[PDB]
Design a protein around this ligand. Structure first.
Ligand SMILES: CC(C)C[C@H](N)C(=O)NS(=O)(=O)OC[C@H]1OC[C@@H](CCCn2cc(CCCCO)nn2)[C@H](O)[C@@H]1O
Ligand SMILES: [Mg+2]
Ligand SMILES: [Zn+2]
Length: 844
């Protein structure tokens, strides 16, 4: 055994030892219990970043842990390969997105291997390969013929200078983020998944997910946004009917979740596109301008609640069907056409958004709910105004004194009796639009024929292959300019036809890849029935919180779609979910020509603990604030430099020790140095133990007759094993597991293990510590284990707790005062000559 720890000598040998043994190449062996540990697969962007290393180390700790406990562990990896990065890189470097992607994949694969992740590389997938995406084209066609996928005109943001469609996030004050040109709202046909048909199942099945973080479940509930409320029709006043046709001349229909407060409605509000808005605006330029500004808006959903709410009165009136109040119709920017009826009622006393709106425009506020003896203040919002549970009705006529549920039913009865309303259930969830006007994506398997319509491509003809011999130029989607791709014949009639040129939302590939890993080379379906039956669901999913809503909802949706197609048996893809925190790092700047700030990467910096300077010249730079690593402020630390400098095990240890997985991880040079030094300590501890005697049979069995000091070390040992096991398998906090092993080694350092029984206990401590740490730092632990013991580490398995090592000594002594029934003198007095060990006599 070499004296000094050298990661570059031992880490490749260890990786070849694991590959040669094929520990990670698993199959559907019905003998061991399966365990499917999955980390969210990466975009092949070019290189790993520190987020990648954190995620996949966390996955590897859990996978190796379960492996050591006798599970048949599948830990697969692959490439979410489609999307915009390759297209932009194609425009920058004038290369093909496919070629750029396959080079990135090959480089990033090497980096993953070098980190020693116990990954089943025989299950690798690359979603840009036809052998992958053909199966989502297949599923598309089946759902399309069922109407679960459908085509319909939608509205997009067109940038006329960049010639591409932009999301609301990419529109800044009505203009494209890169071009700066005013975007144009354009209606175009697009494809949609009818995800709303699965809304109730997607909502209710969250209750099955006892091992999901409650905040992720809450986020999905709010996103789905089910509500049980009331349709209410307010008759249009006789004086307000000019310009209206059909039912819009007869009544204004709204949806409310608070029909218990219908007595306190003080006005109503409609969307800009509402017919009442159009009729009122017909002769009022201020309304036409307000309608125009509403339509031109591009507010993102994550910002919808943070926008300034504005309205204009229309001079039109409707009648409350329960009290006869004549209420004015306002046009408001927060009422969305297409949500419900595009028209709401307002109760400023009991809805906070209505309270702020009314307060802005000095509109009436009518209290109709009371909660205890709390005073109602029409000029200040108190949180109890909106309480649904503990309130009773007031100022509501014959409805007074009722609670929410009884008021709901009474209003429902009153409205239904006179035909003015009925209970209704709504969802905020919109259908899923999957059409992208981009090249580097999965082709949509639709052929357009003027005789036959939009025709799904037959299963025989799938895939529709995306040509990879393309370099996008940034003047429109290349597929639309490629007659060699889109000119085809109709598969129903054989006539002249055109392929769809839009490609799929790349969320589609990540919505089912966890099933494809089960049988990645299966050529007769999305996933083979034998392999889906064996692996079932993912037992553990690990990934960033930014995917807590869309990706997970899409994946749960696809799983239920595939179940209903008979491809899988589960209702839910992910049993346990762990969400890792961000990786943050200090930023460094040095001002330049125009009173601004230029940003320097941390690896090109050296500190003086005073100030910092550039490593190349030694000239100062300004130390700035800490934030998530990104190209924005040039503060991303390349993990490849971390590996080159210290080795994979140090990288893995620093990530797991620095913070709990959910907590943000702060980059720290001293922290990285401390991780490496601990590995040197571990190395020297085993080396020094073997230098004074070599290996012995580890202590096992009855520990009677062991000295107090060695019994104490065995106690620390098996409590540490218990602590670590509970940290890996239950708390999923690996930092405290590392600290616990560090405490074991501390006590070992203070224990004389020189005797024959001492060496036996020392062997037992070390054999346990290297296995307890092997999930985190497998290369050095594999090497150290081979110096201590000849068995296969993974066949020795996870350390067992010896309960007997946790029972402490006992000795019953009789208490007697005057003859009748330091250490023991204090205990017996808690109930004086002492006979050692048997009796204590209290001279009374
Ligand atoms: C399943 C599909 C939809 C996944 C999709 N292909 C994807 O997100 N791919 S990915 O390649 O972007 O990320 C793959 C994983 O690992 C990384 C995690 C990052 C968490 C955020 N972060 C970043 C940083 C700074 C890093 C250093 C910068 O110099 N700090 N925190 C992801 O959340 C995800 O778990
Ligand atoms: Mg259950
Ligand atoms: Zn045809």
């Amino acid at each position: 055994m070499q004296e000094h720890y050298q990661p570059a000598a031992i880490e490749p040998a260890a990786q070849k030892k694991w590959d040669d043994a094929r520990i990670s190449n698993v199959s559907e062996d019905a003998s061991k219990p399966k365990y499917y540990c999955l980390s969210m697969f990466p975009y092949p962007s070019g290189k790993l970043h520190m987020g990648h290393v954190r995620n996949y180390t966390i996955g590897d700790v859990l996978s190796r842990f379960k492996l050591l406990n006798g599970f048949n562990v599948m830990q697969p990896m692959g490439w979410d390969a489609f999307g915009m990065p390759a297209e932009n890189a194609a425009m920058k470097n004038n290369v093909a997105p496919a070629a750029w992607t396959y080079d990135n994949i090959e480089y990033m694969k090497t980096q993953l291997k070098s980190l020693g992740f116990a990954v089943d590389w025989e299950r690798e997938v690359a979603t840009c390969k036809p052998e992958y995406y053909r199966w989502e084209q297949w599923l598309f066609t089946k759902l399309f013929e069922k109407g679960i996928v459908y085509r319909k005109n939608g509205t997009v943001n067109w940038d006329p200078v960049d010639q591409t469609v932009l999301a609301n996030e990419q529109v800044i004050d009505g203009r494209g983020w890169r071009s700066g040109a005013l975007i144009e709202k354009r209606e175009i046909p697009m494809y949609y998944f009818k995800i709303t048909d699965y809304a109730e199942e997607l909502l209710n099945d969250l209750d099955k997910l006892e091992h999901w973080p409650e905040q992720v479940k809450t986020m999905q509930r709010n996103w789905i946004g089910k509500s049980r409320g009331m349709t209410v029709r307010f008759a249009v006043s006789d004086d307000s009917k000019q310009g209206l046709e059909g039912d819009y001349a007869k009544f204004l229909q709204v949806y409310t979740t608070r029909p218990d407060t219908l007595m306190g409605a003080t006005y109503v509000a409609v969307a800009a596109e509402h017919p009442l808005a159009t009729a009122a605006a017909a002769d009022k330029p201020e309304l036409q301008a307000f309608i125009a500004e509403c339509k031109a808006g591009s507010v993102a959903e994550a910002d919808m609640a943070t926008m300034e709410k504005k309205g204009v009165p229309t001079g039109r009136y409707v009648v409350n069907p329960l009290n006869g109040d004549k209420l004015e119709v306002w046009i408001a920017n927060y009422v969305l056409w297409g949500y419900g009826d595009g028209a709401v009622m307002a109760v400023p006393a009991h809805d906070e958004r209505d309270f702020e709106f009314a307060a802005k425009y000095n509109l009436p506020k009518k209290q109709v709910i009371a909660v205890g003896d709390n005073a109602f203040d029409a000029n200040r919002w108190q949180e109890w105004y909106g309480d649904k549970e503990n309130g009773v009705l007031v100022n509501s006529g014959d409805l007074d004194g009722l609670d929410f549920q009884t008021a709901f039913d009474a209003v429902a009865a009153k409205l239904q009796s006179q035909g003015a309303g009925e209970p209704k259930t709504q969802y905020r969830l919109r259908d899923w639009g999957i059409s992208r006007q981009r090249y580097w994506g999965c082709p949509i398997p639709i052929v357009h024929c003027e005789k036959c319509g939009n025709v799904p491509v037959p299963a025989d003809q799938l895939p529709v292959v995306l040509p990879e011999n393309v370099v996008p130029d940034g003047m429109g989607s290349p597929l639309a300019k490629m007659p060699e791709f889109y000119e085809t014949s109709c598969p129903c009639c054989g006539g002249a036809a055109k392929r769809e040129t839009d490609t799929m939302d790349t969320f589609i590939e990540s919505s089912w890849y966890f099933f494809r890993y089960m049988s990645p080379k299966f050529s007769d379906g999305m996933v083979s029935a034998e392999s889906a039956k064996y692996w079932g669901a993912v037992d553990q999913y690990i990934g960033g919180i930014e995917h807590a809503i869309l990706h997970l909802l899409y994946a749960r949706f696809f799983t239920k779609l595939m179940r209903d197609e008979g491809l899988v048996n589960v209702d839910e893809p992910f049993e346990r979910l762990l969400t890792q925190g961000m990786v943050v790092c200090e930023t460094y700047y040095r001002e330049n020509d125009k009173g601004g700030k230029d940003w320097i990467n941390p690896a090109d910096v050296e500190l003086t603990p005073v100030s910092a300077v550039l490593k190349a010249d030694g000239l100062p730079v300004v130390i700035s604030g800490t934030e998530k690593m990104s190209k924005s402020k040039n503060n991303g630390v390349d993990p490849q430099e971390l590996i080159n400098a210290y080795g994979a095990d140090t990288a893995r240890l620093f990530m797991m020790f620095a913070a709990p997985p959910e907590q943000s991880l702060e980059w720290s040079d001293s922290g990285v140095e401390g991780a490496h030094r601990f590995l040197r300590r571990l190395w020297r501890t085993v080396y020094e133990y073997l230098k004074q005697g070599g290996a012995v049979k580890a202590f096992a069995g009855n520990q009677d007759g062991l000295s107090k000091e060695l019994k104490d070390l065995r106690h620390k040992l098996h409590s540490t094993t218990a602590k670590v096991s509970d940290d890996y398998g239950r708390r999923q906090q690996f930092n405290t597991a590392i600290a616990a092993v560090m405490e074991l080694l501390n006590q070992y350092d203070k224990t004389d293990t020189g005797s024959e029984q001492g060496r036996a206990v020392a062997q037992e401590v070390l054999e346990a510590a290297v296995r307890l740490l092997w999930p985190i730092v497998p290369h050095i632990c594999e090497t150290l284990w081979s110096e201590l013991n000849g068995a296969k580490l993974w066949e020795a398995g996870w350390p067992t707790v010896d309960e007997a090592a946790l029972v402490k000594s006992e000795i019953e002594v009789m208490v007697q005062v005057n003859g009748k029934l330091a250490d023991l003198e204090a205990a017996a007095l808690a109930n004086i000559i002492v006979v050692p060990g048997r009796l204590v006599n209290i001279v009374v």
